[PDB]
Amino acid sequence: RQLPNQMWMQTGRLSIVEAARHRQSGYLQLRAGKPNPAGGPFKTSIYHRPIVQAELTAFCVGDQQGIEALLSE
Amino acid sequence: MQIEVTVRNITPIFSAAPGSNYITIDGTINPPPGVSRFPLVRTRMMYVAADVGDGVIKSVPLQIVPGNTMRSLLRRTMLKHVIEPALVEKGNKLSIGAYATAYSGNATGNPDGVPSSFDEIATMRAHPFIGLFGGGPRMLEGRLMVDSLYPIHTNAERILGAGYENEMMSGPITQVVWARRMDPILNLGSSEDVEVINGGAVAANGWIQDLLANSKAAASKKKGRGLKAFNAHEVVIPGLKWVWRISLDRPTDAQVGLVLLALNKMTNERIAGGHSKDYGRFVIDGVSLNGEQVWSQSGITGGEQYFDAVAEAIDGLSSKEFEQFAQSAKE
Amino acid sequence: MQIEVTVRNITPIFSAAPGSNYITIDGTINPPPGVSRFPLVRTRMMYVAADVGDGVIKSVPLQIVPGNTMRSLLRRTMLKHVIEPALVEKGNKLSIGAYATAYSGNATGNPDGVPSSFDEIATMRAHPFIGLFGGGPRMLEGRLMVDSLYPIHTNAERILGAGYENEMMSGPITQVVWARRMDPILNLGSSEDVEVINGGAVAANGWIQDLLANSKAAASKKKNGRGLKAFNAHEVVIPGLKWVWRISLDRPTDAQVGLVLLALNKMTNERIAGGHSKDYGRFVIDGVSLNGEQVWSQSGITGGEQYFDAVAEAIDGLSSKEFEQFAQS
Amino acid sequence: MQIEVTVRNITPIFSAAPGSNYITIDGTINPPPGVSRFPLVRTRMMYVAADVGDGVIKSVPLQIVPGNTMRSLLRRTMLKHVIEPALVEKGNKLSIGAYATAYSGNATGNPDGVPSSFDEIATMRAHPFIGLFGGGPRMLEGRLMVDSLYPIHTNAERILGAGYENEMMSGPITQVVWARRMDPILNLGSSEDVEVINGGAVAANGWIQDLLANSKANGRGLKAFNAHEVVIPGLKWVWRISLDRPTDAQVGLVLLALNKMTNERIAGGHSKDYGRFVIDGVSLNGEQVWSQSGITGGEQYFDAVAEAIDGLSSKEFEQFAQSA
DNA sequence: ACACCCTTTCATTATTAT
DNA sequence: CATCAAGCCTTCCTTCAGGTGTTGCTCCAGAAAGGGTGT
Numbered sequence A: 001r002q003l004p005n006q007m008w009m010q011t012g013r014l015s016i017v018e019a020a021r022h023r024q025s026g027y028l029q030l031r032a033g034k035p036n037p038a039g040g041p042f043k044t045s046i047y048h049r050p051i052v053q054a055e056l057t058a059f060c061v062g063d064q065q066g067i068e069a070l071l072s073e
Numbered sequence B: 001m002q003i004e005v006t007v008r009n010i011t012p013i014f015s016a017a018p019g020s021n022y023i024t025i026d027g028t029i030n031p032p033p034g035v036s037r038f039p040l041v042r043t044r045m046m047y048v049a050a051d052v053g054d055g056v057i058k059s060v061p062l063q064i065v066p067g068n069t070m071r072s073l074l075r076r077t078m079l080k081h082v083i084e085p086a087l088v089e090k091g092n093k094l095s096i097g098a099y100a101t102a103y104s105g106n107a108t109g110n111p112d113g114v115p116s117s118f119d120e121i122a123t124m125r126a127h128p129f130i131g132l133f134g135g136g137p138r139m140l141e142g143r144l145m146v147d148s149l150y151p152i153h154t155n156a157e158r159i160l161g162a163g164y165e166n167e168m169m170s171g172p173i174t175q176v177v178w179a180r181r182m183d184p185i186l187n188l189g190s191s192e193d194v195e196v197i198n199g200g201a202v203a204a205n206g207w208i209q210d211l212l213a214n215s216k217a218a219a220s221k222k223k224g225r226g227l228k229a230f231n232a233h234e235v236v237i238p239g240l241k242w243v244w245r246i247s248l249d250r251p252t253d254a255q256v257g258l259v260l261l262a263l264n265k266m267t268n269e270r271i272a273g274g275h276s277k278d279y280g281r282f283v284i285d286g287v288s289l290n291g292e293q294v295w296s297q298s299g300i301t302g303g304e305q306y307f308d309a310v311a312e313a314i315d316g317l318s319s320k321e322f323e324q325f326a327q328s329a330k331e
Numbered sequence C: 001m002q003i004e005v006t007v008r009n010i011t012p013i014f015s016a017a018p019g020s021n022y023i024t025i026d027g028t029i030n031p032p033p034g035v036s037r038f039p040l041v042r043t044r045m046m047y048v049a050a051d052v053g054d055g056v057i058k059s060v061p062l063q064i065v066p067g068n069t070m071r072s073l074l075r076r077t078m079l080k081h082v083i084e085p086a087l088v089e090k091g092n093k094l095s096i097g098a099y100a101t102a103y104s105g106n107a108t109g110n111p112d113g114v115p116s117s118f119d120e121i122a123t124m125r126a127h128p129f130i131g132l133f134g135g136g137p138r139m140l141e142g143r144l145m146v147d148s149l150y151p152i153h154t155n156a157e158r159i160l161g162a163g164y165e166n167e168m169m170s171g172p173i174t175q176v177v178w179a180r181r182m183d184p185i186l187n188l189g190s191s192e193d194v195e196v197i198n199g200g201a202v203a204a205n206g207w208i209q210d211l212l213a214n215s216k217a218a219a220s221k222k223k224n225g226r227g228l229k230a231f232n233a234h235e236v237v238i239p240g241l242k243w244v245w246r247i248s249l250d251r252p253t254d255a256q257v258g259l260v261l262l263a264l265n266k267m268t269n270e271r272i273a274g275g276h277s278k279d280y281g282r283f284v285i286d287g288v289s290l291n292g293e294q295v296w297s298q299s300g301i302t303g304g305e306q307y308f309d310a311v312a313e314a315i316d317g318l319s320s321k322e323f324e325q326f327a328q329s
Numbered sequence D: 001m002q003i004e005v006t007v008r009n010i011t012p013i014f015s016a017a018p019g020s021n022y023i024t025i026d027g028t029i030n031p032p033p034g035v036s037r038f039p040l041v042r043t044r045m046m047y048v049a050a051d052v053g054d055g056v057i058k059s060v061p062l063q064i065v066p067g068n069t070m071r072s073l074l075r076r077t078m079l080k081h082v083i084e085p086a087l088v089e090k091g092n093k094l095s096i097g098a099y100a101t102a103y104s105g106n107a108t109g110n111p112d113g114v115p116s117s118f119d120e121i122a123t124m125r126a127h128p129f130i131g132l133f134g135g136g137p138r139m140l141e142g143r144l145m146v147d148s149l150y151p152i153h154t155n156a157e158r159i160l161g162a163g164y165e166n167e168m169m170s171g172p173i174t175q176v177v178w179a180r181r182m183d184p185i186l187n188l189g190s191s192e193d194v195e196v197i198n199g200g201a202v203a204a205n206g207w208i209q210d211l212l213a214n215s216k217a218n219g220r221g222l223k224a225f226n227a228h229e230v231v232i233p234g235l236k237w238v239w240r241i242s243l244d245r246p247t248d249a250q251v252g253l254v255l256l257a258l259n260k261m262t263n264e265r266i267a268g269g270h271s272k273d274y275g276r277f278v279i280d281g282v283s284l285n286g287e288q289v290w291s292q293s294g295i296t297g298g299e300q301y302f303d304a305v306a307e308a309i310d311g312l313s314s315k316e317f318e319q320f321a322q323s324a
Numbered sequence E: 001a002c003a004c005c006c007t008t009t010c011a012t013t014a015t016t017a018t
Numbered sequence F: 001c002a003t004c005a006a007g008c009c010t011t012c013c014t015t016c017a018g019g020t021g022t023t024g025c026t027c028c029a030g031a032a033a034g035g036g037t038g039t
Helices: A016-025 A064-072 B067-088 B096-104 B118-125 B154-160 B201-222 B253-264 B304-315 B320-326 C067-090 C096-102 C118-125 C154-160 C201-222 C254-269 C305-316 C321-327 D067-089 D096-103 D118-126 D128-132 D201-216 D248-259 D299-309 D314-321
Strands: A006-012 A045-051 B003-009 B021-023 B038-041 B045-050 B058-063 B144-146 B174-179 B231-236 B241-248 B282-289 C002-009 C021-023 C038-041 C045-050 C058-063 C144-151 C174-181 C230-237 C242-249 C283-290 D002-009 D021-023 D038-041 D045-051 D057-063 D144-146 D174-181 D224-231 D236-243 D277-284
Touching: A006 C045, A016 B118, A016 C067, B003 B253, B045 B154, B045 C174, B058 B154, B067 B096, B067 B144, B067 B253, B067 B304, B096 B320, B096 C201, B118 B320, B174 D045, B201 D096, B241 B253, B253 B282, B253 B304, C002 C254, C045 C154, C058 C144, C058 C154, C067 C144, C067 C254, C067 C305, C096 C321, C144 C154, C201 D118, C242 C254, C254 C283, C254 C305, D002 D248, D067 D096, D067 D128, D067 D144, D067 D248, D067 D299, D096 D314, D118 D128, D118 D314, D128 D248, D128 D299, D128 D314, D236 D248, D248 D277, D248 D299
Parallel strands: B038 B231, C038 C230, D038 D224
Antiparallel strands: A006 A045, B003 B241, B003 B282, B021 B038, B045 B058, B144 B241, B174 B231, C002 C242, C002 C283, C021 C038, C045 C058, C144 C242, C174 C230, D002 D236, D002 D277, D021 D038, D045 D057, D144 D236, D174 D224
8 A cells, every 4th residue: 555545435416407407398208396315316325435546466377478468458 | 608797996805814814013914923913804815826937837825805705796786786676666575584595595504405396496597586596495506606706917817818918917916904993082182072971071081090900901911802903904906907707507598687787786886895994896897798798888788688588587576486495395 | 549638727626525624713624622613625635646856655635526526527518518409409308217327327217237238238338428428227338437637736746647747736726715604684784675574674683583592592502493694614726727637438439539529629618526606617628639639729629520520420310219228228 | 875075185194004114314215224214104005006007007006094094084073073062962971882882883892793683773774873884892884985085196097987087196195204303401501491490400401411321322312303204285185985875864974074074184193284184076976066165965965964963862872882 | 007206214323533 | 717615413213002703514315115196
């Protein structure tokens, strides 16, 4: 580890405002009048994934030329 | 809709920055401790990456008015001048929570996490005023974005881009202004001057002995607060040309018409603060509506369809939308 | 295919961060308890490795916009400016699943796993919009990587690599901006001020007395209704600085590159990372290097004609049934 | 209401600015150390943005009187001349707290962090004087916005919108004016000049000895020599007195203050008669309402303020000044 | 008649650094 | 028409005022299960 381990918050939110505009215009065919951030298509969800900046060392048995081309891609 | 208006403050700008700032008697900002320092309320400074030298881009101060302050100024201008006259000239009336929602965004703290209906959100963003300032208990996304008031300065050169290289200021942009707050009865000099005071000379002399005892207590503390308070405050110098970038994400015709009506009624409004010292007085000398100059001295004299749409929509303005905006699902 | 987008923030950048951060009246962030601390919501920052002034690397705070935020910004500007206008022009509509798939990548049309044949995986990965993000019930891997918006700053020098030492900012790129909510009933001053209110003076005085009762209740509590008086802080990234933005398309078609190019053409109306009421995130695009070839002009993008022609033939050939069969079946 | 008080100072304006500024024998201000350095107090200077090359706008210092000074001057000629005679003529007497809240903004330097009830705010802002000047322990906002006194100068071209395009003074508007205080016991001369001091001439001799002691070496002798920068007399200034949704009594009180504005000094340098000024004009939202006898027109404002001072009472000042 | 939608409904701790 | 003085001194700041109150966040990031009803 080159860095202290930190945490990435990320969220998934479907835009309720844009969906309301599209539902009024009819581009979105949604009969339901109310969103739900707890669950469903409009679930605003929060999720935290751990983050490390480090040096990655792997030991194996393989041809040097073949691995180098794959990891160069 | 990318409204870029340019104003000229004819009186200093005092958007007071919160802090614990001091100043010497000479004018050095935040001196080292031990020297006699006076309280200073600095104006609102932002930091900005600017081009000093050649490619030596640095975070330099630029003293501004916050976009929250300018947003509330635009809101209260279109409220006191467009929304409320058209709402009193008919029989409509607001609840106290609806007034609170129309002015502060929300009717209270403690909002409901339950969202609002899709038809509700579409109708409220179709509203002339609610779609600009979407607050409420269920937090709408208001379609009006209000920028900070930036002085047209070299330190904002990366922000302004092009078209402002003339009438651009440089160098120092602010000024410390001092205030005395003199005790009133020290100015008392005669029996004719003291006849309005209960007791006359007795109460005045009693306050004088109280002042002497307080000064002795303060001298004992150095080695209850009086009416002598000498202090300073940093303002932005007047005569500056400022820019202000209103924007509207896919507006209704009436909403940008309401913004134009508030900009036309920006006359005799104060920008941030210092009401007693007249601070914040300004003259708009430009409005550009997607880049076309639509400000004469008489008024806007352009963008007519926005004005007819907002006239037809404040004709149809009522309190029902304001009341159902302010209504909490929890309450 | 690599696209480098160099932008310059015209307004402050504020990508809000979690956590209970506090600040005093002076700018001391997270003061120790036993002092007046105020709620602060900072910009999105991550620690990054940097080697400036020394050969070794240290963890420095770099204030960025997340790649998820810029990815959804690219998605939303393609939908708002290319995809939905084209679909409205053909008169096509989207279902709940197709909308939650195209606009959020969500699998709520079919929560249950949806099996996709390698052939249809190939055809939807060759779609101009669907192959860029994938998602939906199938959870298709997108052709598109949207990296974080990195400020051109000495902290970012490991991420930036070479070629950015000019116009490289240094020091702190953040500033605490103070915002308060005034109670407007306290600013009521006259009968003409209050006669738009039901009740008027009696309701106004009831609000005042309720506020003073709540204030005395809070003062006795210190030694649950929240009023409208608030005073808080939010750290922003200062305006005027320069950012890089990496968009790498993993073996794309020409129409997908054309769609990202149309996004960068129409993206000047959009805002980065929110702060919407304070106009935060407004920017201009200063450069676009298309595989290292600078293609950005002042008026959109000049050149790159095969991508524009391919995305043109894609959007006249675009219908919603691709989105419905990408979501449902 | 917007009020344009064009005044002309008859005597040199001196509103002293803070700062340990200095002056030489000549006119060099704040010199390098080692030269003969007399203390200088300068007038209040306001940086304003004006064209320097006619295409470039820079910050140029302009001498001003502060809006705080002009505001309290207006409050004192409005209070001392109208409010106090109306209170003593009806027998109304204020407390010392209400007296201080009248001339200053409040009675105590600690204001209570408490909003006042709306009926109190409505009665206070419908009051003429209290509506003009807010404050108090619960910190009312007044309706009067008083700007600084700007000289009509080419430095204030961006400050002054229109109407003065031919009446702009140009050049420097200040002069360093020198003052001193000799020790009078050095200037006796005669034994009949020491027949009024006790101890007589020898006692005066002792004072001279102290001066001789102070010529060799914290007490300070009377012999002082100093300077003050003043604005030049005869300058024409523009005063902006603005009003936020005013009642007619409030505008009438402002016009009563400007009507009998003549026998007042713009504050600073009282002993040298420095604040003496005359008013060349008063504009009431653009119309010229000033005459040689004072303010003509604005009749409804004068009748409203005349009906306001009748029924002016102590109890409103008491409830304005009373802390919660 | 089944997919879409609007309301209940139920689960248990616990301190906090920067 | 030319010099001849072509300054000397000494003052060369004084006292306080050298903030006060208030804000000192809000909320949500569930998803069956049991009812409806709308194509």
